[PDB]
């Protein structure tokens, strides 16, 4: 094979080749109009056709990053719009590509889409193919690390909603409830993908490799270790390419793995027949959301192969990761009730056991009791679930988010205000997703979602590092972030921020902004309130909130709102400064 660009074009097809390139251009340059990206895709698509016809043509043998970076460099508004990004084109490959990835903005500050069904159903009937591309460009631009093959899946499921709803008598009643249930699934899928790339770039290939061992052995307990390692090797490669910008190699390798899984169902799992009958994009998504398989009937006891064996040390030193991956496989297949975050926590703790036990003269007496130490790790988080869920039912979602806003602001005051608000909102959403679930299967729920939300706090904070407490928990370990953040305490080393009148100034626009925007504004002032008064008790903060609610209710109803906010505004500040002094 001499032409990489022709190999990807023939395997994926024109439609999927064009979409994946549009996604790639959207993640690299997030401040560019949609029309300009269509031109870059069309030009690169025409070049791809030429290489398939004639492979010996000049330029067909270059790497996919070279051709990609070459087109990114011809953007006339590279410097004036992206600043220092224009200096990436002054280097060679692969340093040129690494320079580009480093400029992916995880907070693109892009406008919020307010979709109305009238004009939205109109653009779909006008051009379904462009309305399809507009969704890809819009999602990829706000999530520059999105799993690209799944972006095409959601894009086709997006037209499918309009396919069925733009024909009914009430388009609004049909479209909005479907896209909202889909809006939460895409943000969930983006946060999961954002954590996978973070594992590689910050904790190494071994981190993502062990991630798949936990999930795969959990979902496929019947598959033997040699089969699980085969899938792990190819899946880690697939994700490694997507997280590295090789979207064409990523999707093509996902299809090959989706095909390999179906052609070996009898050795992997018995619940894939329905999954292995859908089209390419739907099939790959089915395998990712498939139910777990049944546990074998006569599994040998765990203690046999890694505790009572007089060769645990010997087997470990000859193949450390392979023996440890074996321990994760044996443990994940028998405990599908646990969280993936808990399994990697059990294996990481077992790793630390062998390293210190084999160092002793008689490791046998040292490592023989590891089973008791590991079992105690499962019960440590259990106490936090009850307390959080009880506070959830009492205050509700909104009252819980403001509760977490208070708890986490005193915990890490140095973190910027918009990050503290947005994170605490996601933390409050966890209660609605987990405490209502079975208390005998919810245990992973909390631990699972918390690892995806705390990762975003690290991702947001690593851009502009300002808090010493956040940096430690984010770089110490990947699996122990949740206990590292719950164990943090409000430190008396933080000096309260000086008072800012603007941070407590409000206009009549508070009565107009959308509901989400209204809450954000009210929650922003709550963060800045505690940043200035870090020692305000709960009874005082209770009084201030009720004083503000009755206030905003008063001024949003007067015939002259600006005069109400002008007069009553200073009144609240004096009363609040008096109660908090
Ligand atoms: C403030 O000025 C804004 C300018 O921004 C430019 C961004 O600066 C970054 C650092 N940097 C500095 C200089 C250059 C250009 C060198 C050059 C180019 C074309 C040339 C063509 C020639 N011909 C044969 C006609 C002869 C010499 C050339 C020499 C590029 C980048
Ligand atoms: C590079 O790879 C990583 C490094 O490998 C490290 C792996 O070490 C050996 C792991 N291991 C392998 C096999 C077994 C079970 C054996 C067994 C089976 C049936 C049995 C039937 C019996 N009956 C009489 C009914 C009696 C005993 C039996 C015993 C346990 C542990």
Curated annotation (Swiss-Prot):
Disulfide bonds join 51-60, 73-89, 88-99, 121-166, 165-174, 197-243, 242-250, 262-276, 275-286, 313-358, 357-366, 389-435, 434-445, 458-474, 473-484, 511-556, 555-564. The modification Phosphoserine is found at residues 3, 56, 63, 270, 416, 486. It is found in: Secreted. It comes from the Eukaryota. Phosphorylated by FAM20C in the extracellular medium. CDD domains: ALBUMIN (cd00015). The modification Phosphothreonine is found at residues 81, 417, 419, 543. Plasma. GO terms for molecular function: DNA binding; enterobactin binding; fatty acid binding; metal ion binding; pyridoxal phosphate binding; toxic substance binding. Keywords: Allergen, Calcium, Cleavage on pair of basic residues, Copper, Disulfide bond, Glycation, Glycoprotein, Lipid-binding, Metal-binding, Methylation, Phosphoprotein, Repeat, Secreted, Signal, Zinc. Ca(2+) 2 binds at residues 11, 252, 256. Ca(2+) 1 binds at residues 4, 241, 246, 249. Residues 1-183, 184-376, 377-574 form the Albumin domain. Zn(2+) binds at residues 65, 244, 246. The modification N6-methyllysine is found at residue 531. One of its GO terms (biological process) is cellular response to starvation. Transmembrane segments: none annotated. The modification N6-succinyllysine is found at residues 202, 561. GO terms for cellular component: cytoplasm; extracellular region; extracellular space; protein-containing complex. SUPFAM superfamilies: Serum albumin-like (SSF48552). Cu cation binds at residue 1. Belongs to the ALB/AFP/VDB family. Interacts with FCGRT; this interaction regulates ALB homeostasis. Interacts with TASOR. In plasma, occurs in a covalently-linked complex with chromophore-bound alpha-1-microglobulin; this interaction does not prevent fatty acid binding to ALB. Binds water, Ca(2+), Na(+), K(+), fatty acids, hormones, bilirubin and drugs. Its main function is the regulation of the colloidal osmotic pressure of blood. Major zinc transporter in plasma, typically binds about 80% of all plasma zinc. Major calcium and magnesium transporter in plasma, binds approximately 45% of circulating calcium and magnesium in plasma. Potentially has more than two calcium-binding sites and might additionally bind calcium in a non-specific manner. This is Albumin. It comes from Bos taurus. The gene is ALB.
């Amino acid at each position: 094979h001499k032409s990489e660009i022709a190999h990807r074009f023939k395997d994926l097809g024109e439609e999927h080749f064009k979409g994946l390139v549009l996604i790639a251009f959207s993640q690299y340059l997030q401040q560019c109009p949609f029309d300009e990206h269509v031109k870059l895709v069309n030009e690169l698509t025409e070049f791809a056709k030429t290489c398939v016809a004639d492979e010996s043509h000049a330029g067909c043998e270059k790497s996919l990053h070279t051709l990609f970076g070459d087109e990114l460099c011809k953007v006339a508004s590279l410097r004036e719009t992206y600043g220092d990004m224009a200096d990436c084109c002054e280097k060679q490959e692969p340093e040129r590509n690494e320079c580009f990835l480093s400029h992916k903005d995880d907070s693109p500050d892009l406008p919020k889409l307010k979709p109305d069904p009238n004009t939205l159903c109109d653009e779909f009937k006008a051009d379904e193919k462009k309305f399809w591309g507009k969704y890809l460009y819009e999602i990829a631009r706000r999530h520059p690390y999105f799993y690209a093959p799944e972006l095409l899946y959601y894009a086709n499921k997006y037209n499918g909603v309009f396919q069925e709803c733009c024909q009914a008598e009430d388009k609004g009643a049909c479209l909005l409830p479907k896209i909202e249930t889909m809006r939460e699934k895409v943000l969930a899928s983006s946060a999961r993908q954002r954590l996978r790339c973070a594992s590689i770039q910050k904790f190494g290939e071994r981190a993502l490799k062990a991630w798949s061992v936990a999930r795969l052995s959990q979902k496929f307990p019947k598959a033997e270790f040699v089969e699980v390692t085969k899938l792990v090797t190819d899946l880690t490669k697939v994700h490694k390419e997507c997280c590295h910008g090789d979207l064409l190699e990523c999707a093509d390798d996902r299809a090959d793995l989706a095909k390999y899984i179906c052609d070996n169902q009898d050795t992997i799992s018995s619940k894939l027949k329905e999954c292995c009958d859908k089209p390419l994009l739907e099939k790959s998504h089915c395998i990712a959301e498939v139910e777990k398989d049944a546990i074998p009937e006569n599994l040998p006891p765990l203690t046999a192969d890694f505790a009572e064996d007089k060769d645990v040390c010997k087997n470990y030193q000859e193949a450390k990761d392979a023996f440890l991956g074996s321990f994760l496989y044996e443990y994940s297949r028998r405990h599908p009730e646990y969280a993936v975050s808990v399994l990697l926590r059990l294996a990481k703790e077992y790793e630390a056991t062998l390293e210190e036990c084999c160092a002793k003269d008689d490791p046998h007496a040292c490592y023989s009791t590891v089973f008791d130490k590991l079992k105690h790790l499962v019960d440590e988080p259990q106490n936090l679930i009850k307390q959080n869920c009880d506070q959830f039912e009492k205050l509700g979602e909104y009252g819980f988010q403001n509760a977490l806003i208070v708890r986490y602001t005193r915990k890490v005051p140095q973190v910027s205000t918009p990050t503290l608000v947005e994170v605490s909102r996601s933390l409050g959403k966890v209660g609605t997703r987990c405490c209502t679930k079975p208390e005998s299967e919810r245990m992973p729920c909390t631990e699972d979602y918390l690892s995806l939300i705390l990762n975003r706090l690290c991702v947001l904070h690593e851009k502009t590092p300002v808090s010493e407490k956040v940096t430690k928990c984010c770089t110490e370990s990947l699996v122990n972030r949740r206990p590292c953040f719950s164990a943090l305490t409000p430190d008396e080393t933080y000096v309260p921020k000086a008072f800012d009148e603007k941070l407590f100034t409000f206009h009549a626009d508070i009565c107009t902004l959308p509901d989400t925007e209204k809450q954000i504004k009210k929650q922003t002032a709550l963060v800045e309130l505690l940043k200035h008064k870090p020692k305000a008790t709960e009874e005082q903060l209770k009084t201030v909130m009720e004083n503000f609610v009755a206030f905003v209710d008063k001024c949003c109803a007067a015939d002259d709102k600006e005069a109400c906010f002008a007069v009553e505004g200073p009144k609240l500040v004096v009363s609040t400064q008096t109660a908090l002094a």
